[PDB]
Amino acid sequence: LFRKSKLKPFERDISTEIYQAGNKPCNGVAGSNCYSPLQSYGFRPTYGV
Amino acid sequence: STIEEQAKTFLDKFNHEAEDLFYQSSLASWNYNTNITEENVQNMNNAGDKWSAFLKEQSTLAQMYPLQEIQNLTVKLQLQALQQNGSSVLSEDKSKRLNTILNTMSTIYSTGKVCNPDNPQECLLLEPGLNEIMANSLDYNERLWAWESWRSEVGKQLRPLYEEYVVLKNEMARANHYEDYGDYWRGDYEVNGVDGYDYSRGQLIEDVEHTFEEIKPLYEHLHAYVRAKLMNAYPSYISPIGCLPAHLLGDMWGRFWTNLYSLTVPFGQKPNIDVTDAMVDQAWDAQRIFKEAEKFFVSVGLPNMTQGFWENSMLTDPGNVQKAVCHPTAWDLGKGDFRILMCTKVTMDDFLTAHHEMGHIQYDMAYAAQPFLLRNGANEGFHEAVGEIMSLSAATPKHLKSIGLLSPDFQEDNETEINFLLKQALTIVGTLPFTYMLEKWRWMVFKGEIPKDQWMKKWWEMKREIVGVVEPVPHDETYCDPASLFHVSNDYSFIRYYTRTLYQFQFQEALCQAAKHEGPLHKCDISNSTEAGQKLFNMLRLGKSEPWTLALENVVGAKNMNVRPLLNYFEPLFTWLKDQNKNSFVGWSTDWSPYA
Ligand SMILES: *[C@@H]1O[C@H](CO)[C@@H](O[C@@H]2O[C@H](CO)[C@@H](O[C@@H]3O[C@H](CO[C@H]4O[C@H](CO)[C@@H](O)[C@H](O)[C@@H]4O)[C@@H](O)[C@H](O[C@H]4O[C@H](CO)[C@@H](O)[C@H](O)[C@@H]4O)[C@@H]3O)[C@H](O)[C@H]2NC(C)=O)[C@H](O)[C@H]1NC(C)=O
Ligand SMILES: *[C@@H]1O[C@H](CO)[C@@H](O[C@@H]2O[C@H](CO)[C@@H](O[C@@H]3O[C@H](CO)[C@@H](O)[C@H](O)[C@@H]3O)[C@H](O)[C@H]2NC(C)=O)[C@H](O)[C@H]1NC(C)=O
Ligand SMILES: *[C@@H]1O[C@H](CO)[C@@H](O[C@@H]2O[C@H](CO)[C@@H](O)[C@H](O)[C@H]2NC(C)=O)[C@H](O)[C@H]1NC(C)=O
Ligand SMILES: *[C@@H]1O[C@H](CO)[C@@H](O)[C@H](O)[C@H]1NC(C)=O
Ligand SMILES: *[C@@H]1O[C@H](CO)[C@@H](O)[C@H](O)[C@H]1NC(C)=O
Ligand SMILES: *[C@@H]1O[C@H](CO)[C@@H](O)[C@H](O)[C@H]1NC(C)=O
Secondary structure, rough: HHHHOOOOOOOOOOOOOOOEEOOOOOOOOOOEEEOOOOOOOOOOOOOOO | OOOOHHHHHHHHHHHHHHHHHHHHHHHHHHHHHOOHHHHHHHHHHHHHHHHHHHHHHHHHHHHHHHHHOOOOOOHHHHHHHHHHOOOOOOOOOHHHHHHHHHHHHHHHHHHOOOOOOOOOOOOHHHHHHHHHHHHOOOOHHHHHHHHHHHHHHHHHHHHHHHHHHHHHHHHHHHOOOOHHHHHHHHHHEOOOOOOOOOOOHHHHHHHHHHHHHHHHHHHHHHHHHHHHHHHHHOOOOOOOOOEEEEOOOOOOOOOHHHHHHHOOOOOOOOOOOOOOHHHHOOOOOHHHHHHHHHHHHHOOOOOOOOOOHHHHHHOOOOOOOOOOOOOOOOEEEEEEEEEEEEEOOOOOOHHHHHHHHHHHHHHHHHHHOOOHHHHHOOOOEEEHHHHHHHHHHHHOHHHHHHOOOOOOOOOOOOOHHHHHHHHHHHHHHHHHHHHHHHHHHHHHHHOOOOOOOHHHHHHHHHHHHHHHHHOOOOOOOOOOOHHHHHHOOOOOOOOOHHHHHHHHHHHHHHHHHHOOOOOOOOOOOOOOHHHHHHHHHHHOOOOOOOOOHHHHHHHHHHOOOHHHHHHHHOOHHHHHHHHOOOOOOOOOOOOOOOOO
């Protein structure tokens, strides 16, 4: 969901670090302006097309 | 970086999480409404608790972004909604006390019951028996006693609660930057930050009163005609110049006058437009009615329904052990899931109701592309207005002829149109003075101009003044008559119905004019024209992004509500009523009192 920059063609990235958005350092913890970059989908049989 | 960029990232995280949590809560509500069981009650509570709790921390964390550093005019709206929709300023004891008062008010209204005089033998409830008696019974004593009995046993108990209730709501409002709870409710229509389209909270009071000044001549002529017909029913009780008794309006509170159509029929000899027998002869079922309703939507260019709606929505009463609430509803669970819940019978009313509920579904999908916090109508009135204009064109004789329910041999003349017009007037025109007064009275008490000891003296003074209805039995300050209403006892804003009525007629004239229609407005069909659908769809897809003043100008070319389209629709009825009021005095007298 969040990344510092874009991706070159035919590339992968598995790095999982706190995406810092604020000025102060995240220091490896979440919270204010410190969000985890990976977000999970949600799949249920009743979802629309 | 900057405030805008930092705020933008926060909304992205909130947008994805909110949709998942909202979906689970809505499904729990749907589950209980169809399968009434104790565990599903718990599922509603467990789902509701998490959704309510989630909106708390998000709003609290959203307070670290000041609103003066954002100039996009779209991030500001999303941030503003969170900071007011779940944020709490009252203390813990006051929060618990306020919730207890509201819970008590809702429970006592449902559990409130009155029953036969001087007899503790058998007792009944409001919906089963009281409504039927007020709707059909013609006994003066039975109607008068039931009107007095319910108010005494409901208002008096709720009177002390209301006095405590107004205290906390003002304290919460005064804790916020709004002047009072009355100003808190009026803030929905406020539009700020856009030049040439700004709207102020105080301007609403001026416009509402201004519109009611132009509708006064129409209402009094209807009141004069209705009073004259009531003379033929109850000769002795009613005076030719006084106000009508409050217990003879066909319902419990006089909100609607539809129950008086049989008594006040203009021409009872003429046949009525009824297709209930025709539908039975053609063997129409629940699926056929909804397919017919869907077809009408396609002919104007709007997309029709998906497979998820047909498979999931229930359109018939399950019966047996499975008991469900049969009140029609338009459910929007989000994430591409749309369902409709209603118990359907083979009647014209359900045929018209099918169009009415489908209109809300179409509006929901139009703004599906908007962010989570902008998936709503521009104000509290637009959503209701959209679902009503489609029923206006679904009842036209032309539409029935095209479908085939109405025989082509049917003819139209003087009396078919006049009878149809009077049926609509008794429902729409009658409630408007009642609607404007009730919202007004709640404004002064929240403002504090009317002291508690003079709530009832001021209440009945305006009843004889504006509505022109006098109470049949005097009431002291012990009663709480306004609390006897559902909306007042449940803390719901009531001005939305006044603005909705004006909006629907502005929309219909714009669509009929766009469809190049000619003739009387009340005979208008928009089925075939694809230009009307395209223009309407432009406003629907906007959502909450644009101010409602700008949205209205894109449809009717005006920045404010107007009453002229409403008068033109009822213009043919207006002239005839003047003819029938030649020998009848126009205007009620506030001096008369039925109880000597
Ligand atoms: C901020 O927080 C508030 C809650 O505090 C949220 O506000 C709610 O918003 C919803 C969405 O509009 C409101 O729901 C509406 O309630 C009306 C009240 O009806 C009551 O009575 C009927 C019986 O007459 C019951 O069936 C019903 O369940 C209610 O108990 C409904 O009448 C409305 O339905 C209308 O639209 C449908 C189409 O969808 C039509 O079919 C109906 O006929 C009707 O015209 C509607 O469901 C709710 O009332 C609001 N709460 C309060 C307290 O006002 C906000 O959503 C939230 N802000 C966010 C999340 O951004
Ligand atoms: C206020 O903020 C919103 C949200 O960031 C801005 O909306 C953004 O508008 C731009 C273009 O106006 C969109 O870029 C487009 O992206 C699509 C792919 O989604 C691409 O195909 C287009 O070619 C174009 O690049 C952007 O997506 C959109 N953001 C969102 C979340 O929808 C808006 O422009 C801002 N207001 C002002 C006045 O700048
Ligand atoms: C919109 O067009 C449709 C089809 O072009 C019309 O449907 C016909 O209506 C006539 C009545 O004038 C019937 O005799 C036909 O049997 C209908 N045919 C079909 C296939 O539906 C429809 O009537 C038009 N809309 C309006 C309001 O007249
Ligand atoms: C309703 O709830 C009961 C009890 O949880 C469950 O057994 C049943 O499958 C549910 N659905 C229907 C349609 O009864
Ligand atoms: C409307 O729905 C029907 C299915 O009943 C489908 O055949 C048709 O293509 C739909 N119309 C549009 C415009 O998608
Ligand atoms: C009835 O319609 C005819 C049209 O020929 C008109 O002359 C007459 O004035 C109408 N009467 C009423 C009461 O509307």
